[model samples]
Target chain A: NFLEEEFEINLSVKHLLELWDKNLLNTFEIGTFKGLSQIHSYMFKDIFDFNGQIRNVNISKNNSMFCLARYLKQNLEIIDNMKHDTFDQIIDKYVEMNICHPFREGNGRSMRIWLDLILKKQLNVVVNWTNINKDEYLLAMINSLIDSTNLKLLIKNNLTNKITDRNVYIKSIIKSYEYEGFKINIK
Target chain B: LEEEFEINLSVKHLLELWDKNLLNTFEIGTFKGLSQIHSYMFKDIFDFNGQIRNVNARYLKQNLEIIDNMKHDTFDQIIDKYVEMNICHPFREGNGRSMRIWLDLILKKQLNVVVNWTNINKDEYLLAMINSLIDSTNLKLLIKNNLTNKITDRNVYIKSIIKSYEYEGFKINIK
Candidate 1:
């Protein structure tokens, strides 16, 4: 069942990428919000329904979830208006949307792809996540949950300034052996 | 001349603290210089400016707490809190200007942003502030239209209020 579900996710990721290539990727799709929750716990679902639902969970006393529509609406503007903006502003929006935790599931992965699309279309760059050190990446991401400085540094260090087609990106993913769980079914 | 001096003094006090660090509400008022600014500004009429009005000090302090804790993440939320402060009417005179200054300070401290008051049409802003005190929805949209990360110039803030004889008269009618 796990392998089967993983197979479905691989197919979903491919479909999402295809949609991206066709310029049909939109904010409203459930596919945009799936896949990343693949690695998180089943108990997360009990704590709060994750699917495309906006999370109602609290991270801490100082940090609470944002209202989904409002968060997305505000960030949509940031994404749209990124022309001639600074790296801090761009990564700040990423951190903000990441904190919004828009979907109950796959938010990280979905947001990563979302961020990737923005970077690819707007800045002509894509993060080579495979080049990122996982533990350091995790630590940077956590630090950037509230501030983007570290994550920005991590991204600044790892971004491939060259734009690549979806096939190239997929090939890199395969060659790098980063997403083994994803690759097994994707191939 | 006195009002100008007082305003200058207040602005200087607030900006002086900028190089140091953030200022909490108590530092803004009861423990700090806002009351003193008001006191200096209104000293010709009375020395009541720096003094906290006893009428609703408790509630005003509570409102202060709410504003201090505010994340200012949304324009609507910011307007809602400002409306609350307006309703609290913490001082007998100059509550409007003082609250605006305090709001700008809070925004600078908390969000590292400030409302671009110069870009705001004076009549529209006054009407919006008044109507927002009546109901927040329209005011929310109105304020969201005017927010800027770029802070308004101090000279602009001063010059905007130059014709304050009418403003003073209006303040007298407010209470």
Candidate 2:
């Protein structure tokens, strides 16, 4: 029942790095990794640095850190309001934070979970993205990164009526590569 | 304006509270006085109950007090208040005019940031500002990030506006 072959190392890591800091090596348990590996941390940093983000390891520039904190505070505030169905002032403030690609990984998951909390806790919107196919959900996310017009319209119009169950509604939550035909098991 | 103090004020003072240099943005468009259109934009769009005359003279004065006394020493807080109030559209026609002045004042007085219609391009600036009103929260974040990044010089602001797209978090947009 091991889910190893069903998951792709690079893709999962790619997604995880979006809304997280490289320092997350010692932060918490997510994927199945044993002990805090500085080697993995260093590799993650190298990949992220190779991809984007001022091409540096330092997060300490006073201005950059301030912008990052401000971005975090703002996105959290607006996400808080959006979930509560108090979307009146959200889009604009979120744009103000401009933390789009800020974390390097986990942006999509974080944004989704953040929205989940807002909707469930506040407004009670209850959109799970469970009914959405993995391809479609990823497309929505990628499209949002490109323009956000579609996603904005989704939020504006309450377009997620079909997301009933997180695990059952969607066939397989993982978008991993495999040796055989697509694997449909959850870990 | 002090909340309790304002509540006790006469209508005239109430007018003064909202009008007194508040940091809302408004256009200096040529209108001898409040017209039906202006009144609608004010009352309907902004949800203000007072008449235009009361708005122009007294309300502007009170609004100014809020702008003048903005708390939060951090530039981010100041900008956040501006973004929040901007969407809230707490006033009428005077919002753009007052906000512009307030932004300039803060730039000089506190954050040392500078802005003006002439240098910043009125159309683009207004587009961003008005869009800010329509898409308040996300736009607010865009503006806050812009200010945080010291994106005053024209080209940088435009780039920031576009780059804002590269980041996407959901917006609530209820009100």
Candidate 3:
């Protein structure tokens, strides 16, 4: 994955564990780009140039879009104001963050954890990401940009009451990183 | 006439790359092969013409690797392959043009039919591609209805290639 980076090491997965170990995650904001930024900064701060910044260049996968750089601040404000009082509401906001894709990379890892924060706080549940299949989850995410039904169903099916379970949390982290194609074994 | 020099100049070379059968050496139905096709078509006029970009649905060689391994022996499978590639959006520029050629090659090889682009409207094709990620049904039907047995007809084949350029906003009467 670090095909271009021989100048320095990219031990982001290590930083990810550090995020969990010290309970640094509780310090970040939730459901907003600022919150998303802190999570991304914590994980990739050491490796990337724009660890907590928005991308300047526009990006799209043909039809599906991240908000164009020209209007991102206003877009983020709109998303931040989106209601997240229930399970479906929370998934809806999370899917838009996938659309914001605010930081250049690691949006999935940060946003999945970000979603759980809202789910636990507002809805009293967390995703048992181990129940999710990689390809199915990815296709659901891409499909979610339009329909969102597939992603909502997948997340809803995997919800758990084990909000306080540390193992559950760590496994979610592992699976979260795995979702982005980074397989991590926790020590 | 503005922003036209690069595209207009690249047009004839695009056909020559095919007409001269220079594509025979490039691997068909694969991203690496598509890179070669892009390199041949745009290497002279555009910057970073051949390397894959992390855009559209964004990219990783691994996604293209999976697309390469995807089953494409039937119409549905080929449509699936094309939809996934559009999602892959592997290159920085000209992915549509190069991939159109790539699709024709795949169709020619497997089904003995290639889309005659002359039949597709620019708006409908673009709209179909936009809707493709949600459901490939629209894109598939648009392509299926247009598949021609004219793969061996040089006259018809050249006209279709020119029509593809029209999709990209080229005003080519016939490239």
Candidate 4:
């Protein structure tokens, strides 16, 4: 379980594909823009343009997503060794990772799951994503990518939001690391 | 309200038209559409696209007999439909309004969980709804923590109706 908690940070393109497969999102319809090809394009657009708001990336090949995903997973290793002694440090690390835009699609989905997983594994607190707004997230993300000072504010907001009793959730996950023995506390 | 209704109604109508307005047929619309709006809205609002359409159908279909056999009244049936509303987002525009009336109809018709949106703040109410749909688990946490100071504990939601009634006229105080 502790290993699961530690590796909870590993989000990859394959995981998202599995989610899509489990959801049965493999077909097309009358109103659909063609086939799974279009679905692929839209997912990327949603992440890079609408959600993550990245100005540019090739988005032309499949390997880039895999490369970026691996790159991101590599950086998260730093979190394992670094001392995020306070909730604020965790938030800073989180916002920093988010701005990285590791995948072509499902950034928010993956991020939310990743956030909650880490909080449970490392800190024991559950981070709340529902309260944050799109504009605010966009603003914070853009600020982090563009301006260093903005990154500070983004980190501040991330910490302020997660401050609660739920931090124990992450802490317990770390302490136990009981393979699949993790219990989800949030109802 | 007018624009939201129109947009949602159009989206719903499209879904209904596509599925012939039946639940079973409406299932794949969202999965196929790749509703980035639904995905993002829920993410910012609810935190996760956990239940949108895919998992929702799985959850409800497990009790398909209740739905197919009409074993429950429209109220319990409303619960199923509510799950669909959260998941399918069947149409684009009036999901909010549809959700309200759909929920109100169910509550009034079924469990008697009548929601008076009159005192409810539109922004807070919509956010809470969005939050619930996005991260099914966090909805409670989000509303529990955030909606309190704004809406209090009365369970009043008139502002929601006003929001539906006035969506384009004003913002939902989207935070």
lDDT of all the models against the reference? 0.52, 0.37, 0.76, 0.39
Q: Give candidate 1 misplaced runs (Cα > 4 Å).
A: A1-4, A20-84, A171-187, B1-175
* Native-interface RMSD of candidate 3: 16.3
- State each model's C-alpha RMSD to the native: 21.3, 24.3, 14.7, 16.6
Top candidate (lDDT): 3
Worst 10 residues of 2 chain A by lDDT: A30-39
Q: In candidate 1, what are the lDDT values of residues A1-187, reduced to their tens digit? A: 2312332343344444444444544333221223223212221322334544444434323554443536554554554444424556667766766776656555465566656656666677878776775567677878986667888998888878655555545544342234323332122
Q: List the residue pairs that clash in candidate 3.
A: A60-B56, A61-B56, A61-B57, B55-B58
Better-scoring candidate (lDDT), 1 or 4: 1
Taking all chains together, the TM-score of candidate 2 against the true structure is 0.26
Where does candidate 1 clash, by residue pair?
A: A36-A106, A37-A106, A50-A104, B35-B50, B39-B50
lDDT of 2 by residue, B19-119 (tens): 45322233211121112223432343344533333531554445444544556366556555565445334444444433433444454456555442223
Model 4 lDDT tens row, A74-186? 55455434444455665565566566554454444445444544454456545443344445555666676656456455434544324334333333222222222322331
Superposed by TM-score, candidate 1 places the C-alpha of residue B66 at a distance from the truth, in angstroms, of 61
Instruction: Please give each candidate's TM-score.
Output: 0.35, 0.26, 0.52, 0.33
For model 3, the stretches where C-alpha displacement exceeds 4 angstroms are A1-187, B1-3, B54-59
Pitting candidate 1 against candidate 3, the one with the higher TM-score is 3
Model 1 chain A scores worst on lDDT over the 10 consecutive residues at A30-39
| iRMSD for every model | 24.8, 17.8, 16.3, 8.8
Task: Give TM-scores of chain A for all candidates.
Answer: 0.60, 0.39, 0.83, 0.38
Question: What's the DockQ for every one of the candidates?
Answer: 0.01, 0.01, 0.01, 0.05
Q: Judging by TM-score, tell me the better candidate of 1 and 2.
A: 1
